[PDB]
């Protein structure tokens, strides 16, 4: 053990991070794709599954379930219906910025990872569902899979197998909940964006009824190095409850915000200042922190001074852990204004199957608007705490839940500034 340290090189996943060295089939071959790969093909998917479940892999995408258990669901006995790997290439959750860089640099890593996943479970085909907002790099992915097509290396006779595995690309038609786990599936099907209930599972009934699995693109992109590298080398990165290098990115408000690859456990202040400029106006000039993304409550200063960047420790800090909007925001403007914009976002993009997210996001938007104007009474704001307690756990999907968390965190930490806002509005009305 150590005390979890930070990252040194060769613990990094791939080169060509930021507009750098290469992109071609020969660039990917010179960087390491398609190497010792048929010897992994002709070995056995139980070996791959044992390596996944031994490597301590945490499911990226804001779900927290380890991937090997989901893929152990995926080992249904063989029937007359194929099994599919769906690659969830959307970038929802404003802040995430995630696989736009992956598709901009190394699509052949995605080729390797979908090969690993479909070979891991008796699957037959893969479906890259990309965000429709990504047209140019979507056709970059097209040219790259064309390079793999004319490589004679994917599809029929992948390295010399009698086991073919094709990928098809479906673009987004422009939505947000297609990022989520099953409205994805019914947007593939031709129906409009509508999620599904739980007891028919994706591992049970998925794309048109065939069992399948939705996988995050980070987990897919890190999956071939699980095969071609040593046993649970990826597990030696953090704790033994969670493991792995995570793509910690600062969106938002620092000096020159950008993206870095790091290990699991990093001190947060050193993550901020040592990797994207620094906090503007001084470290004490901040207002607050959000980890996780657009669907994770805020964290104030004194909490995260001691609490560094860990899944379970942020659960202990009463939030979740997600990606790439691990940002501070400034004491200049108001997080009340920012969260009001966040609730306007959740209102303008959410479907309306479940009545609670619909009606609750309506009330919470109007009540945040009256907060920005300072209009209401404090009984209303604790009733807003009450309704946000009444939403979390009543939906199909989790977008209403992701609406419910930030207002709870704001009511926890920034109560008296809201009080002073309402007080000066009472003065101006007075």
């Amino acid at each position: 053990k150590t005390s979890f340290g930070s990252l040194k090189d060769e613990d990094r996943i791939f080169t060509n991070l930021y507009g750098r060295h290469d992109w071609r089939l020969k660039g990917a071959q010179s960087r390491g794709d398609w190497y010792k790969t048929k010897e992994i093909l002709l070995k056995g998917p139980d070996w791959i599954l044992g390596e996944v479940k031994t490597s301590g892999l945490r499911g990226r995408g804001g779900a927290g379930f380890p991937t090997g258990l989901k893929w152990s669901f995926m080992n249904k006995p063989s029937d007359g219906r194929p099994k599919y790997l769906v690659v969830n290439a959307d970038e929802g959750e404003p802040g995430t910025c995630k696989d736009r860089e992956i598709i901009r640099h190394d699509p052949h890593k995605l080729v390797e990872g979908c090969l690993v996943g479909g070979r891991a479970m008796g699957a037959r085909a893969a479906y890259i569902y990309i965000r429709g907002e990504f047209y140019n790099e979507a056709s970059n992915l097209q040219v790259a899979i064309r390079e793999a097509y004319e490589a004679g290396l994917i599809g029929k006779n992948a390295c010399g197998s009698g086991y073919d595995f094709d990928v098809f690309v479906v673009r987004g038609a422009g939505a947000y909940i297609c990022g989520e786990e099953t409205a994805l599936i019914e947007s593939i099907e031709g129906k409009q964006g509508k999620p599904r209930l739980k007891p028919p599972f994706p591992a049970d009934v998925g794309v048109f009824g065939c069992p399948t699995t939705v996988a995050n693109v980070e987990t897919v992109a890190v999956s071939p190095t699980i095969c071609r590298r040593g046993g649970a080398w990826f597990a030696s990165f953090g704790r033994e409850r969670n493991s792995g290098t995570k793509l910690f990115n600062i969106s938002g408000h620092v000096n020159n915000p950008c993206t870095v690859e790091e290990e699991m456990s990093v001190p947060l202040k050193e993550l901020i200042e040592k990797h994207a400029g620094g906090v503007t106006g001084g470290w004490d000039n901040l207002l607050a922190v959000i980890p996780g993304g657009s669907s994770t409550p805020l964290i104030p200063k004194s909490v995260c001074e001691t609490v560094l960047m860990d899944f379970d420790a942020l659960i202990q800090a009463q939030t979740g852990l997600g990606t790439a909007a691990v940002i501070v925001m400034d004491r200049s403007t108001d997080i009340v204004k920012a969260i009001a914009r966040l609730i306007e976002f959740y209102k303008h993009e959410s479907c309306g199957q479940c009545t609670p997210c619909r009606e609750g996001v309506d009330w919470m938007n109007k009540v945040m608007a009256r907060f920005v104007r300072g209009d209401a009474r404090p009984a209303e704001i604790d009733s807003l705490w009450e309704i946000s307690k009444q939403i979390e756990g009543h939906t199909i999907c989790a977008l209403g839940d992701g609406a419910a968390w930030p207002v709870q965190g704001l009511i926890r930490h920034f109560r008296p500034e809201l009080e002073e806002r309402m007080q000066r509005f009472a003065q101006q009305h007075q």
Partner: protein, 230 residues
Amino acid sequence: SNLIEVFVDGQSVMVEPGTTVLQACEKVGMQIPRFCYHERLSVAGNCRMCLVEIEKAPKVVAACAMPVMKGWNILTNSEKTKKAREGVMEFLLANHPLDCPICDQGGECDLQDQSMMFGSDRSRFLEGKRAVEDKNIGPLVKTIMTRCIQCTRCIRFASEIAGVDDLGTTGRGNDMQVGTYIEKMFMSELSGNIIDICPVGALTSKPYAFTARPWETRKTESIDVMDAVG
């Protein structure tokens, strides 16, 4: 021989495998309230009233489309069951405006009965109460889609028994019309059978529309004529 144990408030009863929890709970007598499940239809997931707590669990499942696992023990009358119902019922009465005098299912709503028997005594939320321009369907069905609760029950009846595919959910967020996008006359057979199905006073009969009220009438057993079924 192929039955499953459940406990409704502890009481054991035996289940044919593959049914829903709601069917077993209305087998023993507990009329768990509902807004989109319908026995003569397929099952959507939009009612949200069907929530019920089951023990040894962190969260509350829907009882509408839950297959019966082995050895249930349901809390049909717990704290958070009634709290979840009070939640959902407080949500529904926001964007359903004050037309309960001028309704046509005024005696026979479902928001009425289930909000008296499950909901909240006082309400909240002054503003809001969005409005929708009423569409047209045909001169047999009067259509006020302000009172609609978007419960997706007319649609399943259309796309199963009618199959005509005229009704559609259009929009997102709050704004989600149940209607015909192109103002095409839904005038076919069984178009009169949709009005006993829309559980609020959104869809209603056109000639009957503003004449009487269910309490003043009385029922009488009778036989259909003019057709071979009766």
